[PDB]
Amino acid sequence: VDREQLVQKARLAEQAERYDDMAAAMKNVTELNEPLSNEERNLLSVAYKNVVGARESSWRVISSIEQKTSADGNEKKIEMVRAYREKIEKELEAVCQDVLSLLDNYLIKNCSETQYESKVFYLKMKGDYYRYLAEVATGEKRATVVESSEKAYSEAHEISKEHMQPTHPIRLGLALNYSVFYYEIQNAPEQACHLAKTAFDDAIAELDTLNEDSYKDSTLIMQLLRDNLTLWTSDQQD
Amino acid sequence: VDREQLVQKARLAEQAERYDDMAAAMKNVTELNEPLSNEERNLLSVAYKNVVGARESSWRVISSIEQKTSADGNEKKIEMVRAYREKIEKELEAVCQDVLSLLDNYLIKNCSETQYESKVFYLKMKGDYYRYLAEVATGEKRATVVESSEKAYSEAHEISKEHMQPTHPIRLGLALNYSVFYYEIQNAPEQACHLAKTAFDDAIAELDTLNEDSYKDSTLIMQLLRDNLTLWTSDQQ
Amino acid sequence: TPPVSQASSTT
Amino acid sequence: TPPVSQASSTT
Ligand SMILES: *[C@@H]1O[C@H](CO)[C@@H](O)[C@H](O)[C@H]1NC(C)=O
Ligand SMILES: *[C@@H]1O[C@H](CO)[C@@H](O)[C@H](O)[C@H]1NC(C)=O
């Protein structure tokens, strides 16, 4: 099985929406120890985002049922519901750790000093998945991963500001996710609103730095930024 | 864990839409070697229908890709696409074989003479899952499973006509799925239309036989039948 | 256009 | 209410 066979399998899996296959295929690609292309990077990210997302959805549904079942007072139920939520939870964690291992030992690791774009991408991912862990963790567990997510987002932010156009989709993407981190995890709506607001204004101020390759991505992400600001400026008035 | 906890896990899985867990849970229940209640029958059926369905969808998407990929005349592409479709196909077959093993070794097996409703339900499932296999099989493989599906639907139809009201949801369901078998698998539109038509008419003629517990199911399946009779009459024209 | 089918026993 | 999001690199 060649590398191209794997990337192709990953493309097929995505179309079949069998994302478990997709990640596994992109993981094997990553484990070939060679750098990832833009597309390969995209596939890897998309694959693992959907896997972690699927688990997350199911985790929220069961965790929601674990709230009802306990409030009711039933005992036999709380046992199985809790145990099932922990099963899903352990799957979600194992997935994130799976991505994080790839980022720490392959992608970020083998990045040269001149590859800022990739380093920001991978550092943003690192932040994303540590963030996904934070959502299902508590106490020392949560604080620690919330810390790792912070460190990652922060490092990526530093690089992006120093090496990327404010309109670069990767920098905008970082801003979006980082701001979300602030709002949802840090519970810091001001910082969240600020980062997003700043990022959006910076891109506009240099709205001329757009390029053919990714003007669509940029504008779209800029729109997502404004959306969040709108979605936050309402919750912060109720 | 206990039976009650396995069935509960199956309900939780359904809510999360983790149907693999749901099927595995109901499989473990069935393997307890005890009869299945109506709820448990439903959970098991819903569980494996969604699993086989999920595979079927993926199988179609890839199989289609395998179609236009071969037409283009690629090489290394057809190599992977074909191998992936076969993987999904193998999965789909394994699921069906899983339920079929449950039906032959537990459900249909442990049923007594007096349990006609259950036997009709299970025999319908048997026909269903053999039908799903036919959808992805060809030649010896297909003819053999199309045969088994036929045998199962027929035997279920014999017992339904002989022991159940024309309005009984299980009898209507059998008619619906059996008529679908004729149209989609047998490619026998006349027979498909006839069975579905006949079934609908019978229930209509004995509309008074409905009961509180399942009137909604009956009327709905009757609708589905009429829907097919309308969906088939236009497509064959 | 798949035809309609069903399989839910009466619970 | 989830804050909207996006992480899909430049292909
Ligand atoms: C629904 O119809 C499809 C298409 O004919 C059939 O394959 C399937 O068995 C039916 N669903 C169930 C639960 O039997
Ligand atoms: C989109 O936002 C959600 C919610 O914060 C986040 O969990 C997810 O990582 C983001 N999507 C991607 C592809 O990173």
N-terminal to C-terminal alpha carbon distance within chain B = 56
* Chain D partners (3+ C-beta pairs within 8 A): A
Contact B38, C11 (CB under 8 A): yes
Q: Does B17 touch chain A (CB under 8 A)?
A: yes
Experimental approach was: X-ray
Q: D4: how many CB neighbours lie within 10 A of its CB?
A: 15
Nearest to B178 by CA among C3, A173, A145: C3
Kindly report the nearest CA distance between residue B121 and chain C, in angstroms: 8
Question: What is chain B written as a DSSP string?
Answer: --HHHHHHHHHHHHHHT-HHHHHHHHHHHHTTTS---HHHHHHHHHHHHHHHHHHHHHHHHHHHHHHHHHHHT-SHHHHHHHHHHHHHHHHHHHHHHHHHHHIIIIITTS--TT-HHHHHHHHHHHHHHHHHHHHH--THHHHHHHHHHHHHHHHHHHHHHHHS-TT-HHHHHHHHHHHHIIIIIS--HHHHHHHHHHHHHHHHHTGGG--TTTHHHHHHHHHHHHHHHHHHHHHT-
Taking the CA of residue A157 and the nearest CA in chain D, the distance in Å comes to: 15
B56 lines ligand 1 (CB under 6 A): no
Q: Do B38 and C5 touch (CB under 8 A)?
A: no
Residue B167 to residues A95, B95, B205, B210, B211: CA-CA distances in angstroms?
49, 31, 9, 6, 9
> Would you tell me the crossing angle of helices B3-16 and A75-102 to the nearest 10 degrees?
50
- Resolution in angstroms for this experimental structure? 2.7
How many whole angstroms from B134 Cα to the centroid of ligand 1? Answer: 12
Selecting from A17, A18, A62 the residue whose C-beta is nearest the C-beta of B12 gives A62
Distance from C-alpha of B48 to C-alpha of B36, rounded to nearest angstrom: 15
**Count of residues in chain D:** 11
Read off the CATH number of the domain in which A180 is found.
1.20.190.20
The token pair that represents A174 in the structure block: 């970082």
End-to-end CA distance of chain A: 56
Domain span at B96 = 1-237
Q: C7 and B125 in contact (C-beta within 8 Å)?
A: yes
Looking at the structure of chain A, the number of domains it has is: 1
